[PDB]
Paper text:
The structure of the small 30S subunit core was solved to a resolution of 2.80 Å, but the resolution of its head group reached 2.71 Å. Based on the high-quality cryo-EM maps, we identify the 16S rRNA along with 20 rProteins in this subunit. A large extra density corresponding to bound Era is found nearby the nucleotide rC1051, where this nucleotide, along with r2MG963, rG1050, rC1192, rA1193, rA1194, and rG1195, contribute to stabilize the bound Era via electrostatic interactions. In addition, two Mg2+ ions are observed to coordinate with the Era molecule. Notably, the Era-binding site overlaps with the previously reported tetracycline-binding site in the 30S subunit. This suggests that this specific binding region can accommodate a wide range of tetracycline-based molecules. There are at least seven nucleotides in the small 30S subunit involved that interact with the hydroxy and oxo groups of Era. Previous studies indicate that the action mechanism for the tetracycline class of antibiotics is to halt translation elongation via specific interactions with the small subunit 30S of the ribosome. Our structural data agree with this mechanism where Era is observed to specifically interact with 30S, and this Era-binding site also overlaps with the familiar tigecycline-binding site previously found in the [name] 70S ribosome.
[name], the trimeric inner membrane component of the tripartite system, is responsible for drug recognition and proton motive force (PMF) generation that provides the cellular energy required for substrate transport. The bacterial ribosome represents a major target for antimicrobial agents, as it is vital for protein synthesis and is one of the largest molecular machines in the cell. Eravacycline (Era), a fully synthetic fluorocycline containing the tetracyclic core scaffold with modifications in the tetracyclic D ring, shows enhanced broad-spectrum antibacterial activity in comparison to previous generations of tetracycline-based antibiotics. Our data indicate that the [name] pump primarily uses hydrophobic interactions to bind eravacycline, while the 70S ribosome utilizes electrostatic interactions to bind this drug.
Author numbering:
A (entry chain u): 2 to 64
B (entry chain o): 2 to 88
C (entry chain k): 12 to 128
D (entry chain f): 1 to 104
E (entry chain r): 21 to 72
RNA sequence: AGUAUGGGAGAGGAUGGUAGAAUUCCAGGUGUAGCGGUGAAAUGCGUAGAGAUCUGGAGGAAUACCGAUGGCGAAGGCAGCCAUCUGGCCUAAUACUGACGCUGAGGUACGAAAGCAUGGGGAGCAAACAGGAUUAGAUACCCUGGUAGUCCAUGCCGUAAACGAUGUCUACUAGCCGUUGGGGCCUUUGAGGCUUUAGUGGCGCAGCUAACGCGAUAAGUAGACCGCCUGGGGAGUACGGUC
């Protein structure tokens, strides 16, 4: 955040910069997650799947 | 709590040979010292179930060592139990 | 009556609705408007077009007090975050900065249950 | 006995008292026996966030070799004192005595 | 890694004030654990901010 | 198999304290209309003035980022920071006792969540329950409220797809690639490369298997002790007994 505007900065470029800053921050993902409750078993399963996928990606890259 | 000094005193008192640390008597004396020490803590914290397993392990080890000593030598076992007032 | 040199814009963006509030620094609200306030009764309340229209109508009222420099705080995940800022730029206000203010709990209260449908 | 590190914040208004404050505390430790290894005055500093509607505070660091009862007394005195705003007690193995960063 | 050396700690905080994962920095796990502990202590001592 | 002496890692356990983020409620300042929610609506909340915004308080519960085929624990399971009490594990070298061991019928200890007894607490969520919807019907799915419960202290209960669907202990049998905690060696421009241990993962020869697959963390080759099964229902139910 805190995207200050230059003297001649067009509004569109500032909007794009704010979009990029928000995307880098990742706040939207947390806000989406907070909507509903994830039970411990479901989150453990999701993390296991994510780890397996990451390891597969690393092995594919190394090849 | 028991410091290195107390342990050294116990070992010296029950040592049989010079530099002896592994004889049954020394091990039983050290275990008895620790078991007696832990009584105050377990009186203070009665729901610490995780450390009572270690306490029970010490008790079982003492029982095994005493049974071994009795089988090896009866007089030594009697003297050890008399000194420690165990049973 | 009051003359305010600089102002702040608040965007309560939601899936259902988008609310625009205009305030002056140190607090106090000068004017406000929402999608449902000017038509858009129903699902259109969520459309970004309603968001930009609401922002424009709010800005038009805000001009009455007299101000030329604005700051934007976007607080919500709803569609209309870009629409409101575009409208505020179009109406002629100078935006000093645009920031995000959406809250985040550090494991606070339990969120509601998931919707099975 | 045990080596502790104590970093404590005090209010600017009572700043003139700090010179006395530390002194008395040291005396109490020296009453039992103790040892005072480090004592650094970082000075007034702006806070990263307002503590009790206060934007600046004076930080002071101490390193001691004290007993349990003295530590408890120090904790109680810190808590009941109104001048100081928040303290931190960290047990340290061995004593560190050298020019500490952020000294000046 | 101690709470005192605020500069090194700042060399790993993010603009929002969050800790950066080891995957980006490339640091060792033990170093990361002490790094996070020092950040939390300094954050408690109002030397670095909790958030932005 | 065990003991003494130096070090190291860790959400292991018990007690107390304390920090920041957020939700709800309360009081106040600006301000005037709606807000909220759904696929769409409606119930509901609001001109004794809501929603939005700012300030100051109350209370309960849980610890974003770090966070990871990561860590610790016998299993159940353990996540902010600080102190006290305390269990186990890894690692180096010496010095000790000298088979002191393994398993284990009965027995005994601990044991998720739900539920029970007494006394507290109650933010959020939420069985039952009351309304609004959809439908042919709606005892549900969806929406608005909401009680027990979820939290604490002292006890009881002893059950889970309590799962790796794989009892414990011991010796041996190609290799390759990761990662966590240590030991040793070789370079150096201060971080890398090799080995050795104890964990934790992905492939894979021989061997085994009905097949799928397992494969030094065996479901391979052997030994010691225990538990269990004998077609599908009836039934983990009837009678007796213990709790
Ligand atoms: Mg056994
Ligand atoms: Mg049995
Ligand atoms: Mg019981
Ligand atoms: Mg409901
Ligand atoms: Mg308790
Ligand atoms: Mg069963
Ligand atoms: Mg389980
Ligand atoms: Mg399983
Ligand atoms: Mg089974
Ligand atoms: Mg086998
Ligand atoms: Mg039959
Ligand atoms: Mg029965």
């Amino acid at each position: 955040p805190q995207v200050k505007l230059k003297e001649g900065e067009p509004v569109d470029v500032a909007i794009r910069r704010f979009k990029r800053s928000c995307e880098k921050a990742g706040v939207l993902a947390d806000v989406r997650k907070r909507e509903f409750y994830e039970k411990p078993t479901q989150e453990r399963k999701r993390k296991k799947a994510a780890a397996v996928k990451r390891y597969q990606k690393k092995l594919a890259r190394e090849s | 709590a028991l410091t290195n000094a107390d342990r050294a005193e116990i070992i010296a008192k029950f040592a049989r040979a010079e530099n002896d640390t592994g004889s049954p008597e020394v091990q039983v004396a050290l275990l008895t010292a620790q078991i007696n020490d832990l009584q105050g803590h377990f009186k203070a914290h009665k729901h610490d179930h995780h450390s009572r397993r270690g306490l029970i392990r010490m008790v079982n080890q003492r029982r095994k060592l005493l049974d071994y000593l009795n089988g090896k030598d009866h007089e030594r076992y009697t003297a050890l139990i008399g000194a420690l007032g165990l049973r | 009556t009051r003359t305010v040199s600089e102002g702040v814009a608040h965007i309560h963006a939601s899936f259902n609705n988008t609310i625009v509030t205009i305030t002056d620094r140190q607090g106090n609200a000068l004017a406000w408007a929402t999608s449902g306030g000017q038509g858009f009764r129903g699902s259109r309340k969520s459309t970004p077009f309603a968001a930009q229209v609401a922002a424009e109508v709010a800005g038009k009222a805000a001009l009455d007090y007299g101000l030329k420099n604005l700051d934007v705080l976007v607080k919500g995940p709803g569609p209309g975050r870009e629409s409101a800022v575009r409208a505020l730029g179009a109406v002629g206000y100078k935006i000093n900065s645009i920031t995000d203010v959406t809250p985040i709990p550090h494991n606070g209260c339990r969120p509601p249950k998931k919707r099975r449908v | 006995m045990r080596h502790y590190e104590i970093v404590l914040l005090v209010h600017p208004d009572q700043s003139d008292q700090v010179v006395g404050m530390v002194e008395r505390y040291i005396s109490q430790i020296k009453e039992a026996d103790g040892q005072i290894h480090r004592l650094e005055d970082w000075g007034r500093r702006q806070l990263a966030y307002p503590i009790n509607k206060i934007h600046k505070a004076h930080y002071i660091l101490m390193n001691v070799e004290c007993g349990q009862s003295t530590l408890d007394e120090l904790e109680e005195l810190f808590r009941y004192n109104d001048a100081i705003i928040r303290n931190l007690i960290i047990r340290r193995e061995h004593a560190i005595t050298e020019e500490s960063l952020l000294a000046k | 890694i101690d709470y005192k050396d605020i500069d090194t700690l700042k060399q790993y905080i993010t603009e929002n004030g969050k800790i950066v994962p080891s995957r980006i920095t490339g640091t060792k796990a033990r170093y990361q654990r002490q790094l996070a502990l020092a950040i939390k202590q300094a954050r408690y001592l109002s030397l670095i901010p909790y958030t932005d």
